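Write out structure tokens for Cytolethal distending toxin subunit B.
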Amino acid sequence: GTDLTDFRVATWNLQGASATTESKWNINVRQLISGENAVDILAVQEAGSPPSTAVDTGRVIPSPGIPVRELIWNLSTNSRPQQVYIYFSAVDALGGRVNLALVSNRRADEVFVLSPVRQGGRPLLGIRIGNDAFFTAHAIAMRNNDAPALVEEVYNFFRDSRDPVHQALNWMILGDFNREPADLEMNLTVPVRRASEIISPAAATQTSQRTLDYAVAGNSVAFRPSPLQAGIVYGARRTQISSDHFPVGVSRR
């Protein structure tokens, strides 16, 4: 119990494309995951292609026909955070504008790959570190979209586990839900509402003043609210990155 507060996590839709993401990874993602205020886990949407120097470990990951690879990314041989692990899903083997990733400063103990909940939707990619699981999500930009069903899929996945320790993992879904926080909350079933909390920043997370990028923390057997808060990473700076979404960080209030 009392888990998620040990981690600084974040989510960023970097609006990347497979052919041109080198700077967004080698500069912008690198800055989020290293240095004095590094996040431990970063969820990425529209991830493009991973850094050219990150190398597949060959880890065998069970998956229901969804591409997923573990890569090691060596960042330095001095700077405290020396290497990180990337879990990358090429969603399209074609244009590549809706790929997903998780970056972590610890190897994943377990990797989760859950199927899309709607035709044309993205899968859910998650990792477990100890008693906590973290997912990256990218709901469809449409009216009345798949965000509630994505959250419901994660809640049911853990509830249905045969192992009681897996049923009680603390989970967090970080992503671009493509609807505002209250709009997601009101469209969840009663048991999922009572078993989770939405953690969202007070500010807009994209340039159109909408709050679309945030986190849902939950536990499928015994939920207790966590003292977590979300904020805009770099909210105090005027940034010139080629994404219309801002990174959103989550950690203890």
